[PDB]
Amino acid sequence: NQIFESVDHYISDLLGYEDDALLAATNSLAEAGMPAISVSPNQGKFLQLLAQLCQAKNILELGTLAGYSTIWMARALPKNGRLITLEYDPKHAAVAQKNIDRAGLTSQVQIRTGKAIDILPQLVEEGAGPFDMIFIDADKPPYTEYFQWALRLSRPGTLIVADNVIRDGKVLDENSTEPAVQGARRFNAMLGANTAVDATILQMVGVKEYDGMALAIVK
Amino acid sequence: NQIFESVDHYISDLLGYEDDALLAATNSLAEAGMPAISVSPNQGKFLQLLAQLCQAKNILELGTLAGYSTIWMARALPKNGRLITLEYDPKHAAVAQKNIDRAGLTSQVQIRTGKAIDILPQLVEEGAGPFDMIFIDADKPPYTEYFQWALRLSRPGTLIVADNVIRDGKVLDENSTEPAVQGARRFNAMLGANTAVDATILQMVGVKEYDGMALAIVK
Ligand SMILES: C[S@@+](CC[C@H](N)C(=O)[O-])C[C@H]1O[C@@H](n2cnc3c(N)ncnc32)[C@H](O)[C@@H]1O
Ligand SMILES: C[S@@+](CC[C@H](N)C(=O)[O-])C[C@H]1O[C@@H](n2cnc3c(N)ncnc32)[C@H](O)[C@@H]1O
Numbered sequence: 143n144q145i146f147e148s149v150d151h152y153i154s155d156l157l158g159y160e161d162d163a164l165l166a167a168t169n170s171l172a173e174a175g176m177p178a179i180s181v182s183p184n185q186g187k188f189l190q191l192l193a194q195l196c197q198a199k200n201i202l203e204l205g206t207l208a209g210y211s212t213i214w215m216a217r218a219l220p221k222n223g224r225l226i227t228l229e230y231d232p233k234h235a236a237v238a239q240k241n242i243d244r245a246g247l248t249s250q251v252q253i254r255t256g257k258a259i260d261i262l263p264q265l266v267e268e269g270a271g272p273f274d275m276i277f278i279d280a281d282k283p284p285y286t287e288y289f290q291w292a293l294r295l296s297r298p299g300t301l302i303v304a305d306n307v308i309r310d311g312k313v314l315d316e317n318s319t320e321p322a323v324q325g326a327r328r329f330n331a332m333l334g335a336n337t338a339v340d341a342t343i344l345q346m347v348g349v350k351e352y353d354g355m356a357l358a359i360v361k
Numbered sequence: 362n363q364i365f366e367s368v369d370h371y372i373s374d375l376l377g378y379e380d381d382a383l384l385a386a387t388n389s390l391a392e393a394g395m396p397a398i399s400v401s402p403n404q405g406k407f408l409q410l411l412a413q414l415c416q417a418k419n420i421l422e423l424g425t426l427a428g429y430s431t432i433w434m435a436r437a438l439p440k441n442g443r444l445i446t447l448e449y450d451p452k453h454a455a456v457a458q459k460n461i462d463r464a465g466l467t468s469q470v471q472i473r474t475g476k477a478i479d480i481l482p483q484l485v486e487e488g489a490g491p492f493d494m495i496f497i498d499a500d501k502p503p504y505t506e507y508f509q510w511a512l513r514l515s516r517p518g519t520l521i522v523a524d525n526v527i528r529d530g531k532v533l534d535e536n537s538t539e540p541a542v543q544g545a546r547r548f549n550a551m552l553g554a555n556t557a558v559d560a561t562i563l564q565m566v567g568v569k570e571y572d573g574m575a576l577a578i579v580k
Contacts, residue, residue, distance in 0.1 A: 153561065157562065194559065330371070342372065342376050347566055354368070
C-alpha cells in the first residue's frame with residue numbers, strides 16, 4: 143500500500159537522514175553485484191536507539207553484507223566502543239571493510255570472515271563477551287542455534303535482535319517447506335518457550351517488504 | 362489486511378499472554394462504558410521490554426484510561442519501583458484504581474486525576490523526576506508541550522515514547538483541519554528538529570488500527 147511507503151519517506155525525511163558513508167554502502171551493492179537485502183534507513187536508526195538504550199560498548203552482529211547496519215549501530219558506540227560483525231562471504235567482508243573505512247569506523251569495527259557457527263565458539267574461548275546488544279541477520283535455518291550462542295555471550299539485560307522472522311506472514315503456513323520459513327517458525331516457537339529471556343516480535347512496514355523483528359532481553 | 366491480524370494472533374499466542382488483571386482491565390472498559398483504545402497485548406509486551414532496557418524504577422505515563430498499558434509497564438518494575446499515571450477523566454481514574462488494585466500494584470502505581478498540562482508542572486515542582494521511561498498517550502494537540510515537560514522530568518538515557526503520531530497516515534495531509542492530525546504533525550516536525558534526543562517513528566500494524574509510535578532517548 144502506497145500509505146506504508148509514503149509514511150516511511152515522511153519518517154526518514156525527519157529522522158532517517160542517510161549521510162555519504164551510508165549512501166556509499168547502499169551503492170557498493172550494485173557495484174560488487176551483492177543482493178539489496180540491507181535494513182532500511184528507519185530500521186537503521188531504530189537499531190541505533192536500541193544500542194544507546196543498552197548503553198552499548200560491545201555489539202555482536204551476524205551478517206555484515208556491505209556493512210549498512212554496521213555503520214548505524216557502530217555510530218551509537220562511544221570512542222572506546224567495539225562492534226564485532228561476522229560474514230561468511232569474503233567478497234561481502236572486503237566491501238564492508240571499504241565502507242567501514244570510508245565512515246571513519248576502522249578502529250571501532252572488526253569483521254571476522256567465516257561461518258557464524260564456527261566463529262561463535264572462538265568468541266566464547268577468547269572471552270570477547272559479554273555483548274550489550276547482539277544483532278542476528280544471517281541464514282535463517284540455524285536461528286535457534288545462533289540464539290543459544292547469543293545467550294552464552296550475554297549478560298543480564300543484553301538485548302538480542304533477530305530480523306525477518308515473520309517473512310511476509312508465511313510463518314502462518316505450518317505446511318511451508320521453504321528452509322527460511324521453517325527456520326523462523328522453529329525460532330518463534332523457541333522464543334515463546336524460552337525462560338532465559340522476555341521477548342516480543344515487532345511487525346514492520348515501509349518501503350522494505352512486510353518484515354518481523356524479534357526483541358529479547360536476557361533475565 | 363487479515364495477514365496483520367493473523368500475524369498479531371500468532372505473536373500474542375507465543376509472547377503476548379494476558380493474565381486475569383489484563384483481561385479484567387480490558388473488560389472494565391465495557392462495565393464503565395469507556396472507548397476501545399488501549400495498546401494491544403503485543404504493544405503491551407513491547408512497552409514492558411522497553412521499561413526493562415531502561416532499568417526502570419520510576420515510570421511516568423500520560424492517559425491512564427483503564428490501566429491496561431499501566432499494568433504491563435508496572436510489571437517491569439522491581440518491588441521497590443514506582444509508576445505515576447495522569448488521567449483527565451475522574452471515571453477513568455477510579456476504574457483504573459480498581460483494575461490496578463486487583464493486579465496487586467496499589468503501592469507501586471499512583472493515579473492522579475487532572476489535565477496533564479497542570480500535573481506535569483506539579484511533578485517538576487514536587488521533584489518526582491527524573492523518570493527512567495515516559496509513555497505519552499493522551500490528547501494529540503498538546504504533544505509538543507507534553508514532550509518539553511517530559512525533557513524536564515528526564516535524565517540522560519531516558520526513553521520517551523509518544524503513541525499514535527501517524528493517525529492512520531493522515532499526517533501526510535498538510536491541509537488536514539483535524540486538531541489531532543495537526544498536533545501529531547507538529548510533534549513529528551519537532552522530533553525532526555530536536556537536538557536534545559535521537560528518535561524514530563515505528564509503523565505498527567495488527568489488531569488495532571494502523572498507528573505509529575515515536576521513540577526518543579534523551580542524550
Ligand atoms: C541480510 S544480509 C546482512 C545485511 C546487514 N544486516 C545490513 O542490514 O546491512 C545477510 C548476510 O549474511 C551473510 N551470511 C549468510 N549466511 C551466513 C553464515 N552462515 N554465517 C555468516 N554470515 C552469513 C551473507 O553473506 C550476507 O552478507
Ligand atoms: C489512548 S487512551 C490511554 C490508554 C492507554 N494507552 C492504555 O493502554 O491503557 C487516552 C486517555 O487520555 C486521557 N486524556 C485526554 N486528554 C487528557 C489530558 N489533557 N490530560 C490527561 N489525560 C487526558 C483520556 O481521558 C483517556 O483516558
